[PDB]
Amino acid sequence: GSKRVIVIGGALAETAFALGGAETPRYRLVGADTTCTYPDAAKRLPKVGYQRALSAEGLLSLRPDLVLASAEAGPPTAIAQVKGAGVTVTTFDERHDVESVRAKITGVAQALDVRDAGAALLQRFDRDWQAARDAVAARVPGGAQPPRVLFVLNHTGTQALVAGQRTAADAMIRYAGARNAMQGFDHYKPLTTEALAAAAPDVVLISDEGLAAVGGHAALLATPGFGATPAGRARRVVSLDALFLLGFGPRLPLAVTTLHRRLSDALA
């Protein structure tokens, strides 16, 4: 018999699909949460709510034999309800680093009973990651000092919503050879003109999505304080798909390489 599997969390879903895809003789992926938009086969799974607002009744309506959940999956009441029904829920942490992605690969493969496919994916990943680390170490974007990057997850605002430390953005900026222009706070906050002028970003990074919630590139650089910054003076903007940039899944080597390439282009 085939296990019916639900996956909660975009990076976990990518990992599950990269091990084989929607179907193997051992398991079938039958549901996910709304953050699971990659690959195309994940985007097509029935969804049972946003990862932190799970419906236990919705999740159980798909009759799962196994749930693979990011440690961020919630609320705790819903996860308790699902385990209470005799469903195995196996939880995975989402630390913003490569070793957590590597442990995710082997841990997911082991939960789906596909250890040999996990070893093979991890071998590919390790190969790509060394290449990514080589490429970043070869050259600093801009070829001089490590540039200061401001990441804008959203802009509401009428200010930027921006990433401090202990975020996925901070780690990606650092893996790509740059420095976070925002210092002195953790997680995300709205941005002041006075903090932005202190940040003096050389490049502004923004979600492919969250470039709409400003009006586009030209509108973004018309935000107060942006114009006087080194980024705004040189009009250095880089947009990227949020889940690909920030997801910390099996595309991590490509995500780091890409961010590095974009920052190099921008700082030409």
Binding residues for Ca(2+): 234
Q: Which is nearer to ligand HEM, 87 or 171 (CB)?
A: 171
Q: Which is nearer to ligand HEM, 52 or 133 (CB)?
A: 52
In angstroms, what is the minimal distance from the CB of 188 to ligand HEM? Answer: 4
Question: Do the beta carbons of residue 203 and residue 193 sit within 8 Å?
Answer: no
In angstroms, what is the minimal distance from the CB of 48 to ligand HEM? Answer: 12
In angstroms, what is the minimal distance from the CB of 170 to ligand HEM? Answer: 7
In angstroms, what is the minimal distance from the CB of 92 to ligand HEM? Answer: 13
Name the site residues for ligand HEM (rule: CB under 6 A).
10, 34-35, 50, 52, 153, 163, 167-169, 187-188, 242-243, 246-247
CA-nearest of 158, 150, 4 to 87 is 4
**DSSP string for residues in 128-152:** HHHHHHHHHHH--TTSSSPPEEEEE
Helices 10-19 and 98-111 meet at what angle, rounded to 10? Answer: 60
Contacts of residue 219, Cβ cutoff 8 Å, sequence gap at least 6: none
Q: Which is nearer to ligand HEM, 48 or 246 (CB)?
A: 246
Q: Which is nearer to ligand HEM, 44 or 139 (CB)?
A: 44
Give one word for 46, left, alpha or beta, with left for phi > 0 and alpha for psi -120 to 50. Answer: beta
Q: Which is nearer to ligand HEM, 109 or 153 (CB)?
A: 153
CA-nearest of 240, 243, 205 to 51 is 243
Contacts of residue 103, Cβ cutoff 8 Å, sequence gap at least 6: none
Q: What is the widest separation between alpha-carbon atoms in the chain?
A: 63
Binding-site positions for heme b read: 10, 34, 50-52, 155, 168-169, 188
Contacts of residue 2, Cβ cutoff 8 Å, sequence gap at least 6: 24, 25, 26, 27, 28
The residues with which 212 forms a beta bridge, in sequence order, are: none
In angstroms, what is the minimal distance from the CB of 172 to ligand HEM? Answer: 8
In angstroms, what is the minimal distance from the CB of 94 to ligand HEM? Answer: 7
Q: Which is nearer to ligand HEM, 87 or 259 (CB)?
A: 259
DSSP code for 65? S
Binding-site positions read: 10, 34, 50-52, 155, 168-169, 188, 234
Give the number of residues written for the chain. 268
Distance CA 18, CA 49 (A): 23
